[PDB]
Design an enzyme around this catalytic site. Structure first.
Site, short mmCIF file in Angstrom:
data_model
loop_
_atom_site.label_atom_id
_atom_site.label_comp_id
_atom_site.label_asym_id
_atom_site.label_seq_id
_atom_site.Cartn_x
_atom_site.Cartn_y
_atom_site.Cartn_z
CD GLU A 11 -2.84 -1.32 0.64
OE1 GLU A 11 -3.02 -0.14 0.07
OE2 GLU A 11 -3.61 -2.24 0.55
CG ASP A 20 -8.60 3.24 -3.51
OD1 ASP A 20 -9.24 3.83 -4.48
OD2 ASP A 20 -9.01 2.26 -2.93
#
Ligand code: CL
Ligand code: CL
Length: 162
Positions: A11, A20
């Site tokens: 991530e 995202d």
């Protein structure tokens, strides 16, 4: 290598509200704030989350606090889930980490839905399960990450992450 380090690779780290891969408001190390389109709906979720007026920005410590909580929750999610817990219980340490990873990214519900895959893992049919995982929207959407988790399940080593 551990779940913390693994997820931190997957991530990344961002101290400013970001979008995202799906277009959602996220911050820190993969912490989703809202699916809502509104950046204000994003900053308000974030102030709630941190306990302070953040104005869309947080410190490293703050990022790490959110992260600890989220790995914690992922774990307790798997252990509470009737479908996931038996799989989790049957896996070795490395593969356990791989399942936590998927749970952290797509939630307990989502993972719980890969019926055939969970059945192949349980039966120790590694190559098979990896082939099935790859027939997924997840794979198609974030292939390089997906490959790394897939490899972790196929091999039982952290090889995809050295
Ligand atoms: Cl939160
Ligand atoms: Cl990726």
């Amino acid at each position: 290598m551990n779940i913390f380090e693994m997820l931190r690779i997957d991530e990344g780290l961002r101290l400013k509200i970001y979008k995202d891969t799906e277009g959602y408001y996220t911050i820190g190390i993969g912490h989703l704030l809202t699916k809502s389109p509104s950046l204000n709906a994003a900053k308000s979720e974030l102030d709630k989350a941190i306990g302070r007026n953040t104005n869309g920005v947080i410190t490293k410590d703050e990022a790490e606090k959110l992260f600890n909580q989220d790995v914690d929750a992922a774990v307790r999610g798997i252990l509470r889930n009737a479908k996931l817990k038996p799989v989790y219980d049957s896996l070795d340490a490395v593969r356990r980490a791989a399942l936590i990873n998927m749970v952290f990214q797509m939630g307990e519900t989502g993972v719980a839905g890969f019926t055939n895959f969970l059945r192949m893992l349980q039966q120790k049919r590694w190559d098979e399960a990896a082939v099935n995982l790859a027939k997924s929207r997840w794979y198609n959407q974030t292939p390089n990450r997906a490959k790394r988790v897939i490899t972790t399940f196929r091999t039982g080593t952290w090889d995809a992450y050295k």
